[PDB]
Design a protein around this ligand. Structure first.
Ligand SMILES: OC[C@H]1O[C@H](OC[C@H]2O[C@H](O[C@]3(CO)O[C@H](CO)[C@@H](O)[C@@H]3O)[C@H](O)[C@@H](O)[C@@H]2O)[C@H](O)[C@@H](O)[C@H]1O
Ligand code: CA
Length: 440
């Protein structure tokens, strides 16, 4: 195939930028801080469950919501013995509290019957509830977005919404049920990959990784959007053999393209790179949270990785910041190892772009601890704050199903300083486990 260059009018995680990361990540500015294992507790209210991917109830701008005097955190939880047991639980604390022990458990958001009662063809085939976001509406409602995963339909993933009805008293919160529970988006083929395209490849045994998940709600000027983990479609730079010849995915220069493309073509990562077409996608919603418009991706990762997770985006001090979590084990970049775990970050003057890499390369956070390390963390999430130059980084701590006595839990939070197009971890800024805000 002949070399070409096509950006599709979107931003790209380039091979050249990613290659700079192995050397750059040695700087403590970009490193998840060391945690103290003897301070680490299981979520007392979770009662023997693994609790991993979590997200706070947020105001439209991403700041932590105050629901009737409480903070609310939604989290994936399930049986450590069953990797396919994943449901969304709702945890809550009184505003002002910081202890991990302050987090009470309201239980599952959903009843098993809810997906059937929803009168929603896709939802009644759901087998697992995967990550998303939650916004606190202007009329005081808890508005959840999450991933409908269907194990029965070859791992179909559908962006889904529901309103969570919650009674509040001086002592407790209680989930009464849900309403407006509906599928929003399952891909369109042209802009974002759908499950049929995955099945076209031969699903799981093809080596392809189909994703359409981790939706993050955000507003700008009263317009409503979800930014989410996805993969490109046929019209915005699809996976395939031809993709390795697109200079937009390499960057730097034709000299670098020539050298890097030929190396990749001769490597054992050729097929992996061909299949890699991860994207951070965007859709606009209507005021009833239905689909208004499929939009172009904010960024894509063709050749680099098929998996850029937990999309997060917010405006802070005049600039827009876009983050994603990603595993080095799924990348094709020399120098990046199977131990390496990242939060990558991008910056723009506008929500819809264009986005340029945060610390020249995209590196914001690096974690490389052994999967066996009790203080291992993943799923790092930047929580925007009402004021100041710091965001709070949350993550989950222990690997799922690894230890009988130590479950996946809220990691100790820490501070990330953000100014202009640069970030640095704040020295000795470790907070409580699952702490959402600096202010108390
Ligand atoms: O697709 C095959 C893969 O499926 C399952 O893992 C899916 C996915 O899980 C994690 O992604 C996040 C971030 O932590 O976790 C939830 C799901 O639990 C997702 O909404 C979110 O993106 C991992 O980080 C990913 O690497 C992984 O692909 C299953 O658990 C795997 O064993 C495997 O079968
Ligand atoms: Ca792919």
């Amino acid at each position: 195939q002949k070399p070409y260059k096509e950006t599709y009018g979107i931003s790209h995680i380039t091979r050249h930028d990613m290659l700079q990361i192995p050397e750059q990540q040695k700087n403590e500015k970009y490193q998840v801080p060391e945690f103290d294992s003897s301070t680490i507790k299981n979520i007392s209210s979770a009662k023997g469950l693994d609790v991993w991917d979590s997200w706070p109830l947020q105001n439209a701008d991403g700041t932590v919501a105050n629901y009737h005097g409480y903070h609310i955190v939604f989290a994936l939880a399930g049986d450590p013995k069953n990797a396919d047991d994943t449901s969304i639980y709702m945890f809550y604390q009184k505003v002002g509290e910081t202890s991990i022990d302050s987090w009470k458990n309201a239980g599952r958001v959903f009843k098993d019957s809810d997906k059937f009662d929803a009168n929603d063809s896709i939802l009644k085939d759901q087998t697992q509830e995967w990550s998303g976001s939650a916004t606190f509406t202007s009329d005081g409602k808890i508005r959840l977005f999450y991933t409908d995963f269907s194990g029965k339909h070859y791992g179909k993933q559908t962006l889904t919404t529901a309103q969570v009805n919650v009674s509040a008293s001086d002592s407790s919160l209680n989930i009464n049920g849900v309403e407006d529970y509906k599928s929003i988006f399952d891909g369109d083929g042209k802009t974002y990959q759908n499950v049929q395209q995955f099945i076209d490849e031969g699903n799981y045994s093809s080596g392809d990784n189909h994703t359409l998940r981790d939706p993050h709600y955000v507003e700008d000027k009263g317009h409503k959007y979800l930014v989410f983990e996805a993969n490109t479609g046929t019209e915005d730079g699809y996976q395939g053999e031809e993709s390795l010849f697109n200079k937009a995915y390499y960057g730097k220069s034709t000299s670098f393209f020539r050298q890097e493309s030929q190396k990749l073509l001769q490597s054992d990562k050729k097929r992996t790179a061909e299949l890699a077409n991860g994207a951070l996608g965007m859709i606009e919603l209507n005021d009833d949270y239905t689909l208004k418009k499929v939009m172009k991706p904010l960024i894509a990762s063709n050749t680099v990785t098929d998996e850029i997770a937990r999309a997060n985006v917010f405006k802070m001090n005049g600039k827009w910041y876009l983050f994603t979590d990603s595993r080095g084990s799924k990348m094709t970049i020399d120098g990046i190892t199977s131990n390496d775990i990242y939060m990558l970050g991008y910056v723009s003057n506008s929500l819809t772009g264009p986005y340029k890499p945060l610390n020249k390369t995209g590196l914001v956070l690096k974690m490389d601890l052994d999967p066996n390390d009790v203080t291992f963390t993943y799923s790092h999430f930047a929580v925007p704050q009402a004021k100041g130059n710091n965001v709070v980084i949350t993550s989950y701590m222990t690997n799922r199903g690894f230890y009988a006595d130590k479950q996946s839990t809220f990691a100790p939070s820490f501070l990330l300083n953000i100014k202009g197009k640069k970030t640095s971890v704040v020295k000795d800024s470790i907070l409580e486990q699952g702490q959402l805000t600096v202010n108390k």
